[PDB]
Design a protein around this ligand. Structure first.
Ligand SMILES: Cc1ccc(-c2cc3nccnc3c(NCCCCN)n2)cc1
Length: 268
């Protein structure tokens, strides 16, 4: 079903944007209380069939997810444009937050990346691949509560395979070698991305592989080289990043193992 446009009120505040259109702050009338929302709105009155199809696929994935560490969809609305209404994570993207808050303690960063690993362990159990995991796609509810967002590239895995074979966005810097070379996306390739996300978080929102072309990143990784340890990053956390960047898909850990490593380190 669809949300009632008359129960949605959009504010002038823009939270984000991209090729699809914009994301605006708003409020939606629930069964009794009013709820603060973020609303993804397609540009050009949803003229583009591709953007429409993509928004519905994004909604389809989110409808099936229910986890505390993943952004919740309230619903979809077909009105002046097509709109995807979500619970708002009011501190915004993790990368931008850390850029602006260098005082955040290492224990706090560990806490947040552990939360991301819990959301991803759930996604893995649910057999969905995210395909766009990155620090810009983790939103903060509070400084101690992270949620995974941006499910526009996510896929439900077939019952008989543990990967999706791509037939758009190509965030090479977050992609595992098998994604680049064989177009195969699995929970293991999400683990590689999570390694990059960890590097970003401990680098207070710095972009990875800075100054390098995609082709140069691919060549670097092919010859067994990896990004260095961020300043002040605990060695155990850098060791985990390197494990996430295991070239061999089979030998690379899954999220159950990654989450457990983070869980144990966080609790000493
Ligand atoms: C200062 C600030 C900036 C952005 C947001 C915000 C919150 C959101 N909550 C739920 C869903 N989407 C959201 C969103 N989308 C746009 C940014 C996409 C990043 N990958 N932004 C909040 C505060």
């Amino acid at each position: 079903v669809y949300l009632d446009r008359k129960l949605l009120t959009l504010e002038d505040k823009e939270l984000g944007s991209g090729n699809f259109g914009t994301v605006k702050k708003g409020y939606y009338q629930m069964k009794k209380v009013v709820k603060t929302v973020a609303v993804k709105i397609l540009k050009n009155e949803a003229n583009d069939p591709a953007l429409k199809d993509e928004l519905l696929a994004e909604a389809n994935v989110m409808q099936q997810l229910d986890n505390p560490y993943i952004v919740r969809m309230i619903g979809i609305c077909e009105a002046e444009s097509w709109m995807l209404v979500m619970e708002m994570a009011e501190l915004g993207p993790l990368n931008k937050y850390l850029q602006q808050n260098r005082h955040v303690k290492d224990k706090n960063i560990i806490e947040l990346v552990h939360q991301v690993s819990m959301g991803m362990k759930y996604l893995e159990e649910s057999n969905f691949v995210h395909r766009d995991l990155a620090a810009r796609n983790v939103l903060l509810v509070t400084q101690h509560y992270a949620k995974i967002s941006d499910f526009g590239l996510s896929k439900a895995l077939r019952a008989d395979e543990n990967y999706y074979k791509a037939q758009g966005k190509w965030p090479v810097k977050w992609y595992a070698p098998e994604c680049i070379n064989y177009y195969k996306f699995s929970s293991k390739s999400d683990v590689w991305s999570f390694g990059v996300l960890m590097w970003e978080a401990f680098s207070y929102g710095q972009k990875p592989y800075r100054g390098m072309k995609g082709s140069e990143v691919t060549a670097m990784l092919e010859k067994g080289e990896r990004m260095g340890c961020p300043a002040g990053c605990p060695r155990e956390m850098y060791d985990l990043m390197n494990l996430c960047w295991t070239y061999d898909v089979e030998n690379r850990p899954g999220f159950a193992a990654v989450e457990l490593r983070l869980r144990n380190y966080y609790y000493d």
